[PDB]
Amino acid sequence: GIPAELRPGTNQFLTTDDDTAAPILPGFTPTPTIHIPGEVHSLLELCRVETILEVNNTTEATGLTRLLIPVSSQNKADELCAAFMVDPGRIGPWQSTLVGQICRYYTQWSGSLKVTFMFTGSFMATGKMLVAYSPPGSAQPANRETAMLGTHVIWDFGLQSSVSLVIPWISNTAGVVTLWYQTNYVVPPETPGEAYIIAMGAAQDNFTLKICKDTDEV
Amino acid sequence: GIPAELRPGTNQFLTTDDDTAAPILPGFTPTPTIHIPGEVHSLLELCRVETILEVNNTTEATGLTRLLIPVSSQNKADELCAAFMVDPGRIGPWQSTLVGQICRYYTQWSGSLKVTFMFTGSFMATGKMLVAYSPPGSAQPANRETAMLGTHVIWDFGLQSSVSLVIPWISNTAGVVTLWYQTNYVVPPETPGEAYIIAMGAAQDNFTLKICKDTDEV
Amino acid sequence: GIPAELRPGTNQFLTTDDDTAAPILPGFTPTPTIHIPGEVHSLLELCR
Amino acid sequence: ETAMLGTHVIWDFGLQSSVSLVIPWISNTAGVV
Amino acid sequence: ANIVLAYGEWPEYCPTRPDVSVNRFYTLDSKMWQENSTGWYWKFPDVLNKTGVFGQNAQFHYLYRSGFCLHVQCNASKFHQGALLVAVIPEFVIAGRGSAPHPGFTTTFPGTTGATFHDPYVLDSGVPLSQALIYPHQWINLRTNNCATVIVPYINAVPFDSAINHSNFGLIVIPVSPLKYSSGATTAIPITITIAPLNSEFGGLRQ
Amino acid sequence: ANIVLAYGEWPEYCPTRPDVSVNRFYTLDSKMWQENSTGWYWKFPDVLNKTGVFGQNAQFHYLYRSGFCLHVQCNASKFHQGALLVAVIPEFVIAGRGSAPHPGFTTTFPGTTGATFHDPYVLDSGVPLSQALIYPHQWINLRTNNCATVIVPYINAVPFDSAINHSNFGLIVIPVSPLKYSSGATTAIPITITIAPLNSEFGGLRQ
Amino acid sequence: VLETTINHFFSRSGLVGVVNLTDGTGYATWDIDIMGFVQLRRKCEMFTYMRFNAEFTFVTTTKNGEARPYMLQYMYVPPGAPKPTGRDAFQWQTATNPSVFVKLTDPPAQVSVPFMSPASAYQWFYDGYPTYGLCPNNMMGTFAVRVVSREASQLKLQTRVYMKLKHVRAWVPRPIRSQPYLKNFPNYDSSKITNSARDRSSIKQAN
């Protein structure tokens, strides 16, 4: 007969509460654990993998062609190839990647994003591409030289067929990655004058996510 | 007046729950334990004892004759004597043994089964018998030489009157044990030309049972 | 606010139960025990 | 695919322009390459 | 050989322990195993209740406790075929067969003559005979061996109990394989049982 | 180079482990990548189910467990452009496309010939292809490399399972970048797959 | 290694009786027995000697289901003590019969009856005379229910008893029954005998 008074908060079912429950089958052991490869421990492990962005999500595009940035020989220098924002939670190109899907299950995120471009053109066809990152709050650059001043990477197809651009930091106006025709898409005779670039994004060791939430894709 | 809130799951009677109850007669000692031989501690101890299978469970058979596999002299070689599946939980010959009755109180089981055949014929009558075990998923062999290739034991009545066949492993399509007339049932003059074989089954040190359940024999 | 669920068997008065009760006069001492001869401790002493 | 199961060598022109196939043993029905 | 220790336990000592001729070998009347035979059973305290010194002790002592050395032998020829299961069944409660009849003393306690099984398949108890190998048992095969030795200790929830109104265990022999023979052979072969009550104790010497 | 260890795990040993010619290199028929191609998939236990020693073992053994060394090569010229994603998908469940159809064995288990993707965008499973890089994958760029090596260990919730009724994983190759070429070039370029089953174990030798 | 032990084999609460009050008889008794229901009778009869503590839970309800806060008395009458005869009879007030007072709206009453047989173990197969062979050594007591009130209400009640065994030991296993039960005596049907195995087409067909 120990004294005990029912403090308020009893007689209630708290959904979030981490409290134990009486087992249905006490003393019943489960199947012993075996070694299954590919064990996960956090969603960050799923966030740090490169995944294709749907940068060509514009209209009049079929299924597979929506993942491809079309580059052509008949495009002048100092011209814009493609542009997309950096924030993955908001709808757009990042609605297709995995980090832009996992971050929709949370409310807040903060870390450095990695963007990769991989070129699918003839080995005999080369060119140059300016990949410029516009920090948040700055409008989309209208000219190639304005985009050149900020963070950028000069990408040469002849030497590197896949370039990386680490974005310093983003949070929950967003930050724009633009693709600029630096010189041209030169092409030898008897070779298609139209190639494609695929954009793939991921996260880094700085990425953290706070406060879960239910998605709206369903 | 220690703080304490009634977490959900109170005010309920959980049948499975392993929780204490207030004794009706507190402080009342029971009769002191004496040494009674034959103490049991698990159902596995009851499973590892040989017990007769009802392999002759076909129709038009009386009580005692349902446990006997009839072998006769007027049966050619390369012929089938009797066949029965290995799984004890499913109805059939194992519905009569003890391991096939205890395993009906559970849902799942996994281990090696032992099958024994004991011959009841004249000491002057000998013969040969092929005991073949067909692994699960393989249909019942139609010929003696197809059954010979797999797991088998050559059984000679003149030397051994009781043979053992350890089944490698079974789980919850089943596995078939077949009895083949290898040569013949030779018989001296003035001696019956019809004998019997009794089949008895058990379990091994590998047998385990998971998740209890209520039987349907009642 | 420690977690605690009311296991079945509560809200009942078990006559046999050997459970404590709240004293009517807490902290009130009884008359100190004196030596009274003929003390009993079991019914066996009365049986022999 | 029937020829693939036995002894074989996968020959890629881009990498190797000349491949070798040692035949295990022959004697005096014959063996086919 | 054919030695079997029931439950790996030996009849033992904790009363008056005579152990002079009460431990001698009593041999019951042989049973004639026939081709239509169905089996027999013996409730052991009842079996020895009128056999000389053991009978005198058991009938005139209130309490009793002892083990038993059992030897079942079937004398058959090499031209006879058949099998015999010899099991000891602690508290072998013979049941009725009313579709409520209450057997009778001739069945429940059959004496040194024993009684036959009406339905050997159900063991006259509603339990299938196939599972009867859970008990301390012994196979007798006319082709292999004739002697079946079982040493059964004292199996009871109480250290002592009366030997006249309670049956400690039952001994059953059942022809699972029917006896078969040719023309001119012995149509009924005998089964012999010998009893050696090791470590006998008696108490409460009633008149 | 182009070496990839799936999940940083190697096919390994715990049955009968032949490992004489069951571990040899089986090379499937080349697939002709065209400009309108949509991709192909191979369920691996099904792929080798009739290829010599592995086929004999798999069809006639109940249980099976092994890893795999995979080599996907696309023989293209320097005047051809295109990209190819080579991913291994554990339990690649091919789904139906009824707006309830139940595919068919030609699709679910396509054999050594493989089957094409009807809707490569949804992976014929309702999942977008963009996120398919979560699996152990490899890019094949006709401008950079031709060989794509993936070493996949045994991925299963149970140590052994049948190789005839269950597909451990599926291997998919998809032209994310359509094949483009000029006039006079090879209109269809080949894709070659070689399989090396490291550390094979078999059990339950059925007929 | 835990789900096969005797303790785990027997520890699960289950309905062992149904009791109906009327409160026009007013009361209702229920003698404690394990063999009231076939499912649990078939489990305890698998052994010879058992020794356990039983926990009884009473899930009482009204005819419709709704529970007005009526007060109840569950009285445990150990063997030897006379059972109540009426609603207002003097055996209800006996202090030596343990009693439990609960309301209808209160959680079910739960009590623990210890192993209190005169012998050292229970036994439901008694071979002898005290089918017959009924042993008074295992009575376990009685349970009586009534509504306590200075005036007899009109409430109609139906009580359900759930019994759970713990600290349970068993000795001398014996075959599980196959014949249908006919309540204390292992009577079966001589004519209607159910073969322990279902009949098939022929002995040479595995299925």
Next chain:
Amino acid sequence: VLETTINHFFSRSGLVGVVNLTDGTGYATWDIDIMGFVQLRRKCEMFTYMRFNAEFTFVTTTKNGEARPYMLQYMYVPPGAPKPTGRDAFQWQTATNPSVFVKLTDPPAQVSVPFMSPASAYQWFYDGYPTYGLCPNNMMGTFAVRVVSREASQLKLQTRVYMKLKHVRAWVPRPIRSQPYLKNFPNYDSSKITNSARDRSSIKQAN
């Protein structure tokens, strides 16, 4: 560093089913499944193998909302065990099916079902034949509800089940689904295909 773990990613109770009693059918069953609702189906299908213990809470209510103290029975039927067919059928009284007796006015009933698959992990993508590809390895049991009463009341009920996962491990992550679901099979619509990203004006506009 805590809100991104799998344990935290999955540990939150949520509605997994709706159950309606009528008590004129009298009872109502509900087979345990995770893919009943799209929100939680989309989360568990992100992985291949999962291993967890599920906690079920039943928030039952009347049609209006008011709760008379009626008594309820939540019976858990593990896979293999037959499910109840009627209100008074004999499967309700089976002692091996765990049961929970609570009142309407009592707090919600809460129970914990452990990881009890025959395999070492669950899997909702099974590639093979036992779309098809349904694995009996993950059934997790059943839940049945009825009002216990000697007479069938007229109460109308509606039960809500809330399931919470803990001690949860996952293996082999896979893409989250984008196509709408069509209940066990990953069927999608061939014609109606929803692009994972919303369409914008042109590829050169960042917004």
